[PDB]
Each structure stands twice: as structure tokens, then as C-alpha cells.
Amino acid sequence: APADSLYSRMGGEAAVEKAVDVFYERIVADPQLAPFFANVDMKKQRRKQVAFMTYVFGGSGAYEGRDLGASHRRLIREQGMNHHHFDLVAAHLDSTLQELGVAQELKAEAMAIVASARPLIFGT
Ligand code: HEM
Ligand SMILES: [C-]#N
């Protein structure tokens, strides 16, 4: 049932779009992460992140973006992207969801789903 996904329960599109917007305002202010995004079109990147999060939170049928591993392979191989950056990024999202008032159980579910992206991203 549409209402029963994590996506729907956390407030659906308005909630995910707001979370992604705040998430990237924190990331571009973070000296440890901002250099990775300094020449990225952040309007397009926000849209891509909304689409990905919507998919893994159960809000869309089938992801139409690029494979996560392929999308970050160049960053890991040539720009020093590493597991510590992943932890920093995850913590920005957790703090964002907390600030936006996401219920603790839903925040835990969302963040476990983000944790599941780690092997995908690093090709482990
Ligand atoms: C923590 C979970 C993460 C998720 C869910 C995630 C998800 C995504 C998605 C969906 C895209 C767009 C791919 C596309 O369709 O083109 C992307 C691109 C990108 N990601 Fe991540 N990512 C994560 C971690 C990171 C980390 C740790 C870094 C570096 C600190 C990072 C840096 C980037 C950059 C710079 C791009 C844009 C690359 C480009 O277009 O040139 N991501 N990510
Ligand atoms: C990756 N954002």
C-alpha cells in the first residue's frame, strides 16, 4: 500500500526534498566535504539525490539513475573519497532528519538503508 512505505510514512516528497536541500547546505559548508562538490551542479545533484532516496525509501518503483558504484568509482580511485567521508555524509543526513523532526524509529530505518548503500558505493 502506498501509505505504508518508509518514504510515505516520513512525509513523502515534501519531507525528502527538504531533507536533501538541508543535507547539501550542510555538506557545502563542511570543509571536509565541500571540495568534492565545488564544481558540481548542485541543482541537478539535489534532484538526483531526491530520486535515489525516494527509491531506496520505497517511494518509487525502480531506480532510473546511474549505478551507485559506477557513479562514485572515479571519486574513490582518483579523488581520495573514502569510508570516513561516507560516515561524515551519513551523519549530516542523520542530523538533518533529526532537525526536521523525523520520528526516531523512521530515522533509524532511513539511516540503516543509507548504511546498506556503503558496499554498493565502494564496490565491496
Ligand atoms: C552516503 C551515502 C551516499 C549516497 C546515497 C550517494 C548518492 C549519490 C547519488 C544518487 C549520486 C548521483 C549519481 C548519478 O546518478 O549521477 C551521487 C553523486 C555524487 N556523490 Fe554521492 N552518495 C553518497 C556518498 C558520497 C560521498 C561520501 C561522497 C564524497 C565525499 C559523495 C560525492 C558525490 C559526488 C561528488 C557526486 C557527483 C559526481 C559528479 O557528478 O561529478 N557521495 N551520489
Ligand atoms: C553524494 N551526495
Side-chain angles (χ1 to χ4, degrees):
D4 292 358
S5 64
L6 170 65
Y7 177 80
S8 297
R9 289 179 286 115
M10 67 194 324
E13 179 170 67
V16 176
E17 295 199 331
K18 177 66 165 178
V20 169
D21 195 36
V22 171
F23 170 77
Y24 279 121
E25 293 299 351
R26 300 173 59 109
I27 282 169
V28 302
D30 180 339
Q32 291 182 78
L33 298 175
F36 289 98
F37 296 88
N39 208 27
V40 171
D41 185 323
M42 293 306 292
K43 180 172 182 174
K44 299 182 180 187
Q45 179 62 26
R46 287 173 151 78
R47 167 174 291 280
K48 289 172 167 180
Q49 189 64 263
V50 172
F52 178 74
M53 296 287 181
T54 296
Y55 169 67
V56 297
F57 298 162
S60 62
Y63 187 49
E64 274 151 30
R66 178 174 180 201
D67 178 85
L68 271 198
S71 300
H72 297 83
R73 187 173 57 244
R74 54 197 194 271
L75 293 163
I76 296 156
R77 292 197 174 162
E78 298 284 323
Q79 293 164 257
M81 174 183 152
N82 62 40
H83 274 64
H84 176 61
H85 297 124
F86 184 98
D87 289 337
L88 295 182
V89 166
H92 280 299
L93 183 58
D94 179 84
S95 289
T96 294
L97 293 178
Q98 176 66 24
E99 199 190 17
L100 297 178
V102 177
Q104 173 73 22
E105 301 66 24
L106 304 188
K107 186 172 62 77
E109 186 171 355
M111 292 311 307
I113 292 168
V114 173
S116 86
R118 204 175 82 170
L120 300 183
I121 281 161
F122 290 97
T124 298

